Amino acid sequence: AEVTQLSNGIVVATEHNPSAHTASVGVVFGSGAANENPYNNGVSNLWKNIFLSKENSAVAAKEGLALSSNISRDFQSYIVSSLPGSTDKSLDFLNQSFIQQKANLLSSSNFEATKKSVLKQVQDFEDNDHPNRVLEHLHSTAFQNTPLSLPTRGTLESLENLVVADLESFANNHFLNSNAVVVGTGNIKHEDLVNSIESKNLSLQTGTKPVLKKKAAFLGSEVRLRDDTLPKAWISLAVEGEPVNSPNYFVAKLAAQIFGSYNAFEPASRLQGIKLLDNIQEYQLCDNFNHFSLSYKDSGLWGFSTATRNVTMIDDLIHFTLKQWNRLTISVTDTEVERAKSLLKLQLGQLYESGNPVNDANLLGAEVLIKGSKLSLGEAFKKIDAITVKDVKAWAGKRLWDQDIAIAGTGQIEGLLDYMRIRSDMSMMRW
Amino acid sequence: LTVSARDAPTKISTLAVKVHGGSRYATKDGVAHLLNRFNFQNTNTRSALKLVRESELLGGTFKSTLDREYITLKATFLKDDLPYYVNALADVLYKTAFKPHELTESVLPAARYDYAVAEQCPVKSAEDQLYAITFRKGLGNPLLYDGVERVSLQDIKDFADKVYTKENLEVSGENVVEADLKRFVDESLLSTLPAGKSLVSKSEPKFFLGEENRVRFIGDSVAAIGIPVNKASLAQYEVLANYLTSALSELSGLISSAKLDKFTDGGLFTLFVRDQDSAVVSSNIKKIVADLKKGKDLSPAINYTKLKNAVQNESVSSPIELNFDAVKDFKLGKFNYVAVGDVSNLPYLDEL
Amino acid sequence: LTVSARDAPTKISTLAVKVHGGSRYATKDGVAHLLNRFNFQNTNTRSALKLVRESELLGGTFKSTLDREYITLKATFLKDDLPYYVNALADVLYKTAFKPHELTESVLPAARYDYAVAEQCPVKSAEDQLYAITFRKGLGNPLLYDGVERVSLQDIKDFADKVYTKENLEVSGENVVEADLKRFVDESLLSTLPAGKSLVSKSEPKFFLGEENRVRFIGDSVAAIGIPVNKASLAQYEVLANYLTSALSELSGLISSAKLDKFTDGGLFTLFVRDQDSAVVSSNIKKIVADLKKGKDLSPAINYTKLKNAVQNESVSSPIELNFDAVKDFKLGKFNYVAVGDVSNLPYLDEL
Amino acid sequence: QSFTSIARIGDYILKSPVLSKLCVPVANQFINLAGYKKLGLKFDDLIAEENPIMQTALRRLPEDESYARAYRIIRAHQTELTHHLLPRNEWIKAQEDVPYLLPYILEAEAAAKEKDELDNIEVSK
Amino acid sequence: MAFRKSNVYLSLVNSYIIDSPQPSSINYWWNMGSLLGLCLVIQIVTGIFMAMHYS
Amino acid sequence: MAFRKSNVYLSLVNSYIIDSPQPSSINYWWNMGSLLGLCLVIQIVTGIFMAMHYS
Ligand code: HEC
Ligand code: HEC
Ligand SMILES: COc1c(O)c(C)c(C/C=C(\C)CC/C=C(\C)CC/C=C(/C)CC/C=C(\C)CC/C=C(\C)CCC=C(C)C)c(O)c1OC
Ligand SMILES: COc1c(O)c(C)c(C/C=C(\C)CC/C=C(\C)CC/C=C(/C)CC/C=C(\C)CC/C=C(\C)CCC=C(C)C)c(O)c1OC
């Protein structure tokens, strides 16, 4: 449970955990899809794909190393996993690919074979992964004409028109030092890694900063992707949430836990202590749903997602759910808040502490990049337990009560009523 | 009644009661399935509802998984609430109500949904076919329930009596203080369980070879090969699996999935080729079989197969570890084949 | 273009156009099925509706059957209206419209119902499995349509072009004056048909042996054996079929059905054991295989197998007739086996 | 009034030998005067079913009892419409007039009451 | 289906007066309702005709 | 479902006045119907009150 981080030339961050069996090293950049443009959208996803290409991947495999990378909105990360002993051979492969081979990975035979893969990849996504496709579109309309609206995997149109020069252009503007953090998780010590790094000098484009832009903003709107040939209806709905490093980051995350997630087929799920289940189970209004409090640097999204085959009662699904959310402003109970506290701790635990160093790396790098440090799991619990009913009520009265929303859906959505109908349910009549 | 553990300064502990009751030991088709689904229902003192409402207020969940050999009752929770989940798991094993209405209202439905999900994924339709033809009645028993042969409430009770005993299970706690764990297991109802016999037979399963099965299916086509491994000859196959599923092998882009299922008395190697049209499936496999018949290895992935076999932190009780740094050559004797999908346009065992 | 006949003083004649277009010649799975179902739909000059309304007023009906080898277009009617049904059958072969809407509205549905009915009778699920494993791609082709591989309106048109030719069909009229029949066939559109090739190959199908398949099913359990016969060695198997299905054999009460399918280039012998519970099926078959391995015959049913093979008055064009009064001893070499139903409680090829 | 409540009072009286000898004979006389047995019905057949508890109960009732309840109810309606009673040898005997649905009704009520309790549990820190 | 079922107006009449499923055992006490409708009509009809001559 | 949907009386109101699916493009010419109901009410109300004083 130690968050160690020191700066010499490069800001090095590590979180050691003795019993681990393995160790992971890599760099995480403070720039992701939210830094691209509508036309070069998909560059970051492309980088990730070449970094994992058959050529580069075969080199580290001989050495007994494994590769992993993830593209997000605010950040990007390249990671190399290894045994606790080869904690040095990872640092060689890292520098070899980001300085020496930052021109060998971009050959006219590799880039074309990779481009052909992300194209079949992103296409496959839009053709079949409906729930994620919808959540991606939710960000698209909620933050339109603003950074957060750009899909992480990029659009098929900005992708097929992307050239090697664009990769370089992006890389030379974001893969800088002042916008980077070298992460090390697994078992290796902070002082073990920091030495192998402060050994090899060379700055490589120092003093350079990435370009700036215009702040992200929420806009009440919707995008309806009707498709009557699909067998279900997938919809996502949300209000403007909380950004990371916000006084209410936790109240919000707790508020989502109150309604939580559900799966109509799993017996135990049907028994949960969520009032909403009394309303939706009578006529079986949906196969599943899940609330969330997504947070980013400039903004966030608080809402839920759901999938259903009861295409003639979608208005009741949406109506009941939004009536429950009304309660957070006027009648949420102590026991509901308490049930949430326990469950939030359990999930926040399983995330920050799993048996996989790669997840730890991403989380560590991402956090240190936005707030210059990581909040310890124990420090979180103290904040979570401190939340009162009054807090939830004040938060909801600001974020949920009579506030614009964003909607997105695909499939048999004829039954999803108009905007103003849904919008009206964000409140209740009173004397 | 082996009680293992392993402490740590983390806040999330995870109790788990492994039991030798999987499909491999199933007396009737899918009975193990039904029982895994019958877990956490009603006990004689606590209802499934109270159990959930309580654990939620504490901060923990339950789950019951079904392997080909095991039936695991896991429980994830906050550290200091250890005894509760020990007695909870204890209660399930010793006194689940088994009410006739719980079968018709919760169990059967949950089970019907399980079979449905699997009936739509062709690779699993294949994996099930491999086991059925290699081990004709041991590990080749149907994993899930489908109603081909009757299974009453009583049959589910009998199988519970056999499987749930002190001599057939093993408590295992991750992120738990062994001192307290052993103390609580003995202080619970675990020790009251009528310790019967252990069905873990050491004699190697009588496997077959050169067998093949073809199943017509509407969806993606899949061709797969199944190879029975030895108790000691499994460490080489493991590197093979990681070799074919890596950047080192040239034909990694020609196969969907490849793995080695490790048991306590041998194992099974599986290779999967999946694609939309039958033509690409027939080619990619006809190439794999040919290139493997002219085997090669040299163990360049000796450090990759060892690294990938370590990322499994839940398996800190795995069999042989250093058997890898030995053999480094692979051939391809007799194996088993299964065609699923566009049958009239798929290879036969012969032309392979 | 062989035009056979046979007059009589009866009032009901029956024209029939046999064609070598069955499943055995099917280019794509079930295409023969679709075409048999597409018959009597719309032609370019007569609608399916007018055809029916007219024939009803005359006094006759149509029907299109599907064999493993043939596709027969039969027509039962009153004697003196002969030319009408000749031109009717002529019109179908030469100019059926094949409108995209007839496929979706009449053909596919009719076909879907056919497959459904057969998917519920286990003996047929078995018979289909026997053929598929003995003749791996000839007569082992799927008899009915099930959508595993695409089949467009065009694919149905191409197959029609091949199969419907003067060199691949044979007119046959029961209770008809051959003089007039030949006169009308030539005076019709039959002779305008672009006479292609005859797909009737004489070379014996390359059959296999010692093959087995098991299919899980919810209903009655069935165990069946399939035996490939020779072009001349089929006359003995015929008496065997009538022997096992008679009062002379002691084990006639232990088998559900037994028969010999006669083709133009060999044949297939089938034996069926069907019952509710798996135990009785396992026994009855394990007994048949044992008693047949210690073969016996003596041909006491030599006059019964000849009498039963004569009651077939529609088959007055059958192959060998006097081959029966020869061989009189049967053994049991290698054969094929299929388990359908309660699989986990049914015999394997081994223990037979 | 719930069946849980009816049972509480009824059992208390049934156990105490003071009331048990005083009441039961009156109750037996009451049941005979009611006359439902002359119509071929068992008391449990008379319980009003239009509520969730009774619907759950009837759903859990084993097949053979269900077909029998059905025959008794239809037979009753037909006799009633004819303004007759069944011939005495067809009347339900006291040994037969068993509370066959009662155990299902009580189980459902407890399940229901528990849920009501759990949905409203307070928490003390 | 029958016209009495498909017509917008006739179906109302069909569901309330023609095909309405009644319990086989109801007695003459269940005849008072219709008698009440009849009374309502008799009151309205005789009332309107007298209203023509009333001041 | 919502109470407005389940109640015997409210569902009528819901299907005719609340959830009734209307073609998105109807113009002000489609507003005359409601205006006709209003007229009918105004005629009945003012008529009954005057009937109280009329001979
Ligand atoms: C205008 C239509 C009209 C309707 C509709 C009507 N009535 Fe009348 N009613 C009258 C008139 C006119 C009188 C005065 C003449 C009379 O005394 O009968 C009257 C008188 C009465 C009287 C006095 C009887 C007496 O002793 O003279 C009663 C009581 C009565 N109505 C009851 C009813 C009932 C109950 C209804 C309806 C359910 C009804 N009315 C409907 C017009 C009507
Ligand atoms: C008793 C209720 C009553 C109803 C219902 C009623 N009216 Fe009248 N109406 C009267 C009375 C009373 C008068 C006489 C007083 C007057 O002249 O306005 C009258 C008079 C009239 C007149 C003469 C107006 C004038 O020049 O004085 C007309 C026209 C008329 N009504 C139309 C209607 C229409 C159209 C309706 C309904 C759609 C209607 N009425 C409904 C009672 C009613
Ligand atoms: C589920 O169980 C049922 C059941 O549902 C029903 C419906 C019935 C049958 C009974 C009924 C349907 C009774 C219904 C009664 C009514 C709908 C009455 C409605 C009342 C009215 C007063 C209508 C209004 C009349 C007028 C406006 C016109 C009268 C005036 C006129 C004609 C003036 C003419 C003028 C001139 C100058 C000629 C049962 O017996 C029954 O038992 C089991
Ligand atoms: C499919 O398309 C539609 C559509 O369907 C509808 C419904 C509307 C909306 C319009 C309407 C619903 C109009 C409806 C009108 C009516 C139902 C009127 C019914 C009429 C009556 C006269 C009711 C009768 C009233 C009474 C008996 C009482 C009055 C008397 C009183 C209160 C006396 C009180 C006495 C004392 C002493 C105090 C649309 O605009 C529309 O457009 C697209």
Side-chain angles (χ1 to χ4, degrees), chain E residues 36 39-55:
Chain E
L36 285 167
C39 287
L40 190 56
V41 177
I42 289 175
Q43 290 312 290
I44 291 182
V45 177
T46 57
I48 294 170
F49 279 96
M50 282 191 292
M52 289 175 184
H53 308 285
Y54 177 85
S55 297

Side-chain angles (χ1 to χ4, degrees), chain F residues 11-44:
Chain F
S11 62
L12 253 291
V13 177
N14 181 242
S15 74
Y16 282 80
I17 291 174
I18 303 170
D19 283 347
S20 181
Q22 303 303 322
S24 66
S25 62
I26 53 170
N27 61 39
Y28 278 97
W29 285 107
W30 271 257
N31 289 30
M32 305 300 106
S34 51
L35 240 42
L36 285 167
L38 207 215
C39 287
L40 190 56
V41 177
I42 289 175
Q43 290 312 290
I44 291 182

